[PDB]
Amino acid sequence: XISXXISXARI
Amino acid sequence: XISXXISXARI
Ligand SMILES: [Cl-]
Ligand SMILES: [Cl-]
Numbered sequence: 001x002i003s004x005x006i007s008x009a010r011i
Numbered sequence: 012x013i014s015x016x017i018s019x020a021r022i
Contacts, residue, residue, distance in 0.1 A: 001022075004015015011012075 001017075002015075003018045003020075004013075006012075007014045009014075
């Protein structure tokens with residue numbers, strides 16, 4: 001399916 | 012940044 005996206009580590 | 016998306020494990 002969906003794996004990940006935007007983690008938050010940078011953004 | 013971008014982390015992941017669609018892996019290929021299913022799709
Ligand atoms: Cl990020
Ligand atoms: Cl997949």
